[PDB]
Design a protein around this ligand. Structure first.
Ligand SMILES: CCCCCCCCCCCCCCCCCC(=O)OC[C@H](COP(=O)([O-])OCC[N+](C)(C)C)OC(=O)CCCCCCCCCCCCCCCCC
Ligand SMILES: NC(=O)C1=CN([C@@H]2O[C@H](COP(=O)(O)OP(=O)(O)OC[C@H]3O[C@@H](n4cnc5c(N)ncnc54)[C@H](OP(=O)(O)O)[C@@H]3O)[C@@H](O)[C@H]2O)C=CC1
Ligand SMILES: CCCCCCCCCCC[C@H](O)CC(=O)SCCNC(=O)CCNC(=O)[C@H](O)C(C)(C)COP(=O)(O)O
Ligand code: SF4
Ligand code: SF4
Lengths: 198, 6, 386, 340, 174, 75, 156, 114
């Protein structure tokens, strides 16, 4: 059993209401989950406003952006779930603000609020395809220069569709449709028996 | 030196 | 194009692979646009198709200078999701090898920094000490680096009977080895010049660009996730964070030499106070059963078979757990469905943020300055590219 | 004996052609192994060059597709084991300079016979033998005549053995195109009859290769003597200048009697290390391309020839200078076509 | 607890001291002394072929399949070594041997795919697949690195004596 | 003033995917020539190179008439 | 005097020179680079064997590809392989470069460097042990010793 | 229906942007074929540009067209600045790959699953 300190669960819950009241407009759900982490969920339009309040509020200074990520729940209408994890060196706490973005409904960029996001937002576009308005220079960071398709999307094949080899005839590296010599063995692992939720 | 025994 | 010149992927100066498309008016750098992904390999997507225990080896490869400290971050994360915590001896071990690993990273960062600067003898001096440390890894895990020793429920196997004594002899002496490097670089009439007042980063700007590492500590911001948010038993030890002022390449360096010193203080304690006990959780549910038990008890075989073939079956949830990896804050955001294989595992790499800062650090600087600044960020392209 | 063809068509797929190819290391060869490997065929490449040189061929073949065997032409046993398990044998053995220990007969007629001879003993389904175009048993160049001698013999050792007969080949690393371009070193570029009355029809190497490969996988070709020729003929004059044109190097065609010139070829021939020109080469160079009245090769075997000007830029680029290296073929003027 | 790594009168004595440091390069000479000192220390290198860097019993090294003393190969094709391999390296297909027992018709470890994690060593119930001590198996051709049951069984027979000693030393720990 | 039409006519026939002797000043690229929307774009660009003046993104949309192009170029 | 003998001896000399002094150009893609820096380091001195610590893409006799050869880096590897001298060699190091390694099924990793550069010695192991690389470099030395370039010239 | 717009409010405005990009590429094709020493013909390349710009001619929705040119503009910026090399540009031409026939009889003769 982990050493939970209820002292935290309460204080972070209380801040979650604080933020919910301060910004009734964009906060949809706030919840301090077990594991004692607070996640304020905001409408995509509240990206700029909710972050700024956290970066510049005396009672909630959240100066650095730990991470910007986008889980992809294909079932969810709004496929991506942009998650921003922020740290507060003054109150030694962490909060996560998560929004929802569909493939062709872009989110605002927070490079203004935190310049850390300049790179992570490019990372989210390259892997998942979400677009960030007002971004200084959005362009693929991790994928190859000519890569077609957004890789971390759940609908993208792991091996992908193209692989590279050197061809003598043309004396230059050349893509070809992927041909694998031992396909990824897809072990089915889920057990047909559940675990009675505690 | 896996085993110190010759 | 102001003579745009790719720093080039193959360059001894560029750690690993870095194309820095730089436009330089003669020997002055006007703008640095680092290119990344020369080492993207898919580590984040591959993990979704693998079970929790078979994704542990990926973390060692994310930033392999710091082989284990990275594991601890996934461990902690998977332990939180399961609400299980490791046994007392395992915790001390992880702090013991957590620190040994910090030294290993700093010996790389300080000595590799010098090799690019042009000092080559410090690298050979300390790579011999590194070597000796690797041997600890090997005699504990089996592998010199890429051990897989720190698993999600504790470490894998107790320390060999005799390691602690040797992690003492070494520690008892390593100091002098750090001292030597010093007599060679800390006050060199020339190290200072190429390092002092190069890449100064303000305190407000360091927090803003998410630097979170020595890079923040070097600017005078006091933040060590190991003291602010204790993980494992780094709370029971006593160490001094080496904060810096006049943050610049030289100051941060001094900080990295000082944490090498402070880690020897933490290692000493761990050897002095490591408890008798088990090194893995007793829940066969999360930790694999001992081989004598699985070969004599039916419940243990069933638990061995299911654990290795299927998996932990972590309860559904999501967590961001960050430790203080030698480079800086290493965090895993591990979203998890009830399944035995994860759903997402964004690895926050202290390094994706640091590189971004290269632009705001190396401004109006010469070609040689860029080489010095890539060194003062300890960029391991594995963590950045993931 | 066969291998059902499974796969999508690229590397790591199977086509079922196990083929010994004795002279693969060659300029043509390199290409033959390329397609055979691309298609997924099993390729056995006999070699007598050192292993370091054979390395270039390893990468185009997929894992286990390419097998390399040590082989000596004088030793009959080596040819025997190479064709043991092949069902297709392709012979590209040829040279321009009669070497100390191998005569034109050997490289063209003697050896290529023993090879097909064994292939039959083995029971290979088909043998493809390659001999130069316009090869009369009476042609001036010993080379061409000797080659002619071979295409006959091998018939008797191996009946219904395809005999593709390519023209001089156009391709990167070829001689036809590079040789002329390399005349730069020579201040003046001798051209018999001032490069006239020796109309020549080049053929891209790949076209030749693809053609050859297609032969291996087609029942229509048996005893066929195809002639891969090209998409356009040329008087040697335009060819020479054109080359120099893309190379962007001056041209001074100079008339020099073939009589005296055969002597220049003799001079280089004298050189120990791979003579650059050959008395025979000289003659061959002037031997006018013959018109086409034989079994159609390209197109007939399935590949549409590729014009010289199209890929010339790639073959002649290395010969340009610091700036000329940046010129492209369409701003350049393409030389006229003389069918004659 | 924090510490200031670099946080900071002018007297002739002081200045003259400082000026001498710049003028006659005093600290630079200090650095030369350190390297001259080691020049006199014994070098730490080992004759690689003649002397070998020490590896203790858990070293993972090269894969081998063990056999029972009697001579019956240990593997019983439960195939969870395949299940837990992180890289998909091990491929196993099995059928009941005429004896009626259960054995693997094909066991192929692709060593180029393998990342030498040592979990297979961990997972096997009969402990048939073990991480053998040898690390020197560099091969001229890629195909040689792919290993079928016969190479691994042969690898097992060659190194069985040391593998048995190594497992003997570390089994109490596991 | 006609010199412009002289040049404009020369540019239209030279690309050779249009005006095979059906070139007319009243002729409209989209209306009767059938040349594609994109091809027109190529045309306007072409005219820009010979004229030495680059016409804006939009006004290309209004002129599908060579004669109207000469009208605008003269301005 | 038989030239054949004269030739073999000469070849050997040539082989001894290339095999004694192999100046490696290492890439350090990934981590197996850390295990090579260890070779260069004091326990297992590469120099003692004549292998220089490091050289540029030109003066380099052997290229050691350590680490994953990702699809973006694949065009470069080739360039640098193509920018080396006429007597050149490639020692693939690491399961990530021998084949694909832990990242074989990924979309951004070339499944092996021998698909982009011809490879002469494949050194196995996720962090192939430094001694193992040293074993691999020594096997390249035995591969060169056996090469007989001039005798084939003479017999050709 | 009822969808928030990305860059243009209607296909009309969007098409304006496509025109601009076409021009951009059209003006760029020649330069690339020279700065990359590619062995292609400017005319040939310019047709390729047309190919791509039409491969996606069917899109009717304004939002999809806007992101397509968002992607398109970054493509030419990497094409320019020579971030893409010859190997990444030529890939567009699919030069090495063997073309597959689409005739039923052709497929029948070769692949199990067409
Ligand atoms: C000036 C340039 C260098 C001139 C030669 C310098 C000495 C070279 C030499 O001694 O070669 C030793 C080498 C020694 O190599 P080796 O093949 O005799 O083997 C010696 C032992 N090991 C394998 C450890 C090197 O000479 C040879 O390779 C054998 C043939 C020598 C033929 C010399 C005349 C031709
Ligand atoms: N343009 C052209 O080159 C034309 C060629 N041809 C014919 O096509 C064939 C292929 O041409 P190409 O590839 O250019 O010829 P090459 O000069 O490249 O030689 C072809 C191969 O034959 C091998 N070879 C040569 N001599 C011997 C020998 N005595 N014993 C064993 N092997 C030998 C060579 O290997 P190694 O060098 O390793 O010994 C080489 O790899 C030739 O036989 C030629 O007659 C016909 C018309 C035009
Ligand atoms: C050789 C150089 C290589 C350069 C190649 C280049 O970079 C790659 C490329 O062009 S990427 C093409 C994608 N370009 C679009 O997707 C625009 C789509 N534009 C629309 O769909 C319009 O909204 C509309 C409906 C009006 C189309 O109608 P119309 O028939 O064109 O008129
Ligand atoms: S686990 Fe041990 S026994 Fe079961 S299959 Fe793999 S190897 Fe054979
Ligand atoms: S092989 Fe193992 S070690 Fe070498 S790079 Fe790939 S992962 Fe890192």
């Amino acid at each position: 059993v982990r050493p939970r300190s209820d002292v935290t669960h309460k204080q972070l819950s209380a801040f979650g209401e604080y933020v919910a009241e301060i910004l009734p407009k964009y906060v949809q759900q706030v919840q301090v989950s077990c594991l004692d982490e607070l996640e304020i969920c905001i409408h995509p339009d509240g990206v700029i406003p909710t972050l700024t309040f956290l970066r510049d509020h005396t009672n909630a200074q959240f100066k650095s952006l730990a991470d910007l990520t986008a889980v992809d729940v294909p079932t969810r209408q709004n496929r991506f779930e942009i998650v921003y994890n922020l740290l507060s060196l003054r109150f030694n706490s962490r909060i996560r603000v998560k929004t929802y973005a569909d493939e062709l409904t872009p989110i605002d960029s927070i490079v203004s609020v935190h310049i850390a996001a300049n790179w992570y937002e490019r990372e989210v576009w390259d892997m998942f395809g979400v677009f960030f308005f007002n971004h200084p220079d959005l362009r693929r960071i991790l994928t190859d220069y000519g890569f077609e398709g957004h890789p971390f999307r759940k609908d993208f094949p792991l091996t992908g569709y193209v692989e590279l080899r050197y061809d003598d005839e043309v004396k230059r590296v050349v893509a070809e449709p992927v041909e694998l010599a031992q396909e990824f063995r897809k072990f089915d692992l889920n057990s047909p028996w559940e675990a009675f939720p505690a | 030196c896996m085993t110190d025994d010759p | 194009t102001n003579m745009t010149l790719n720093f080039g992927p193959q360059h001894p100066a560029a750690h690993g692979v870095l194309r820095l498309v730089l436009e330089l008016s003669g020997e002055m750098v006007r703008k640095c646009d680092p290119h990344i992904g020369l080492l993207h390999r898919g580590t984040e997507k591959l993990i979704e198709y693998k079970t929790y225990l078979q994704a542990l080896p990926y973390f060692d490869r994310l930033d392999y200078v710091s082989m284990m400290c990275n594991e601890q971050a996934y461990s902690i994360a998977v332990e939180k999701l399961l609400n299980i915590q490791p046994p007392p001896r395992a915790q001390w071990i992880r702090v013991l090898f957590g620190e040994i690993t910090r030294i290993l990273n700093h010996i790389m960062a300080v000595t590799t920094h010098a090799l690019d600067i042009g000092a080559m003898t410090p690298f050979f001096w300390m790579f011999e000490e590194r070597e000796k440390m690797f041997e600890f890894y090997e005699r504990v895990s089996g592998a010199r680096m890429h051990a897989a020793y720190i698993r999600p429920g504790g470490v894998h196997q107790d320390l060999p009977l005799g390691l602690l004594d040797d992690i003492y002899e070494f520690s008892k002496n390593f100091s002098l080895r750090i001292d030597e490097v010093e007599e060679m670089l800390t006050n060199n009439r020339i190290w200072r010049n190429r390092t002092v007042d190069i890449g100064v980063v303000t305190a407000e700007d360091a927090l803003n660009y998410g630097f979170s590492g020595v890079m923040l500590r070097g600017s005078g911001i006091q933040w060590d996730l190991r003291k602010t948010q204790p993980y494992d038993v780094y709370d029971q030890v006593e160490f001094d964070v080496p904060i810096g002022s006049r943050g610049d390449c030289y100051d941060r360096y001094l900080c990295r030499v000082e944490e090498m010193r402070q880690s020897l203080r933490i290692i000493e304690q761990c050897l002095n106070k490591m408890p008798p006990g088990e090194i893995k959780v007793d829940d066969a549910k999360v930790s694999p059963p001992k081989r004598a038990e699985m070969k004599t008890s039916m419940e243990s075989l069933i638990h061995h078979f299911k654990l290795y073939t299927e998996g932990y079956q972590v309860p559904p949830g999501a967590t961001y757990t960050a430790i203080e990896a030698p480079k800086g804050e290493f965090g895993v955001y591990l979203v998890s469905d009830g399944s035995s294989r994860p759903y997402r595992c964004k690895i926050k790499a202290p390094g994706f943020a640091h590189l971004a800062g290269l632009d705001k650090m190396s401004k109006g600087h010469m070609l040689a300055d860029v080489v010095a600044i890539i060194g003062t960020q300890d960029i391991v392209f594995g963590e950045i590219d993931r | 004996h066969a291998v059902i063809p499974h796969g999508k068509g690229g590397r790591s797929s199977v086509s079922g052609v196990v083929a010994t190819v004795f002279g693969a290391t060659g300029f043509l060869g390199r290409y033959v192994v390329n397609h055979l490997g691309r298609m997924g065929s099993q390729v056995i490449i006999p070699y007598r060059c050192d292993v370091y040189d054979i390395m270039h061929l390893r990468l185009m073949g997929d894992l286990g597709q390419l097998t390399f065997l040590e082989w000596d032409a004088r030793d009959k046993d080596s040819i025997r084991k190479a064709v043991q398990h092949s069902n297709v044998v392709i012979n590209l053995i040829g040279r321009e300079w009669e070497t100390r220990n191998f005569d034109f007969e050997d490289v063209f007629v003697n050896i290529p016979r023993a090879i097909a001879q064994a292939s039959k003993e083995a029971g290979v389904e088909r043998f493809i033998h390659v001999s130069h175009l316009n090869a009369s048993m009476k042609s001036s160049s010993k080379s061409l005549r000797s080659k002619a001698v071979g295409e006959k013999e091998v018939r008797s050792v191996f009946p219904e053995a395809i005999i593709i007969r390519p023209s001089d080949i156009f391709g990167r690393e070829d001689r036809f195109l590079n040789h002329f371009a390399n005349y730069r070193w020579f201040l003046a570029v001798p051209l018999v009859s001032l490069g006239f009355k020796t109309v020549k029809q080049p053929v891209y190497v790949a076209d030749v290769s693809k053609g050859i490969v297609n032969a291996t996988k087609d029942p229509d070709a048996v005893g066929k003597t195809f002639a891969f020729t090209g998409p356009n003929r040329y008087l040697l004059f335009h060819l020479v200048k054109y080359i120099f044109g893309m190379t962007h190097r001056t041209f001074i065609p100079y008339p020099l009697p073939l009589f005296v010139y055969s002597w220049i070829g003799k001079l280089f021939g004298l050189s120990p290390f791979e003579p650059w020109t050959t008395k025979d080469k000289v003659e061959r160079i002037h031997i006018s391309d013959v018109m086409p009245t034989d079994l159609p090769g390209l197109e007939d075997l399935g590949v549409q020839p590729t014009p010289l000007e199209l890929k010339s830029i790639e073959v002649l680029r290395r010969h340009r200078t610091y700036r000329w290296l940046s010129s492209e073929i369409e701003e350049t003027k393409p030389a006229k076509t003389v069918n004659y | 607890t924090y510490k200031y790594v670099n946080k900071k009168e002018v007297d002739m004595k002081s200045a003259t001291d400082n000026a001498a440091r710049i003028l006659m390069w005093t600290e630079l000479i200090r650095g030369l002394g350190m390297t001259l000192s080691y020049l006199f220390r014994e070098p730490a290198t080992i004759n690689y072929p003649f002397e070998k860097g020490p590896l203790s019993p858990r070293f993972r090294g090269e894969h081998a399949l063990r056999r029972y003393p009697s001579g019956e190969e240990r593997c019983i094709a439960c195939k969870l070594c395949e299940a837990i391999c992180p890289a998909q390296a091990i491929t196993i297909e099995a059928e009941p041997r005429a004896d009626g027992s259960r054995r693997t018709t094909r066991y192929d470890i692709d060593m180029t795919k393998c990342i030498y994690c040592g979990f297979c060593q961990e997972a096997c119930p009969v402990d048939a697949i073990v991480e053998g001590p040898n690390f020197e198996f560099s091969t001229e051709t890629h195909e040689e690195l792919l290993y079928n049951k016969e190479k691994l069984l042969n690898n097992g027979d060659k190194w069985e004596a040391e593998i048995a000693a190594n497992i003997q030393a570390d089994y109490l720990y596991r | 003033l006609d010199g412009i039409k002289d040049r404009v006519l020369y540019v239209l026939k030279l690309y050779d995917k249009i005006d095979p002797e059906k070139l007319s000043v009243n002729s409209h690229f989209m209306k009767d020539l059938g040349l594609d929307s994109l091809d027109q774009v190529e045309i306007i660009m072409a005219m820009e190179d010979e004229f030495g003046f680059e016409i804006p993104d939009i006004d290309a949309e209004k002129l599908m008439c060579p004669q109207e192009i000469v009208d605008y170029i003269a301005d | 005097s038989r030239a054949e003998y004269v030739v073999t001896k000469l070849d050997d000399l040539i082989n001894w020179a290339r095999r004694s002094s192999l100046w490696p150009m290492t890439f350090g893609l990934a981590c197996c680079a850390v295990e090579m820096m260890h070779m260069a380091a004091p326990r297992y001195d590469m120099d003692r064997f004549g292998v220089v610590f490091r050289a540029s893409p030109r003066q380099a006799d052997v290229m050691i590809v350590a680490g994953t050869l990702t699809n973006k880096m694949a065009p470069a590897l080739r360039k640098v392989y193509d920018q080396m001298p006429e007597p050149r060699y490639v020692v693939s190091m690491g399961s990530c470069a021998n084949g694909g390694g832990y990242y074989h099924y990924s979309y951004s990793v070339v499944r092996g460097c021998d698909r982009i550069v011809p490879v002469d010695i494949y050194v196995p192991g996720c962090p192939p042990t430094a001694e193992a690389l040293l074993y691999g470099i020594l096997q390249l030395q035995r591969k060169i010793k056996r090469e007989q370039k001039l005798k084939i010239w003479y017999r050709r | 229906t009822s969808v928030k717009p990305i860059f243009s409010r209607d296909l009309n405005e969007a098409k304006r942007r496509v025109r601009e990009l076409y021009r951009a590429w059209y003006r760029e094709v020649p330069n690339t074929v020279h700065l990359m020493q590619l062995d292609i013909t400017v005319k040939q390349g310019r047709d390729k540009v047309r190919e791509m710009f039409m491969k996606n001619a069917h899109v009717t929705d304004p939002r999809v067209v806007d992101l397509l040119v968002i992607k398109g503009k970054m493509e030419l910026q990497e094409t320019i600045k020579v971030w893409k090399q010859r190997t990444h540009v030529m890939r567009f031409f699919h030069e090495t790959e063997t073309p597959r026939p689409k005739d039923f009889l052709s497929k029948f003769y070769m692949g199990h699953d067409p």
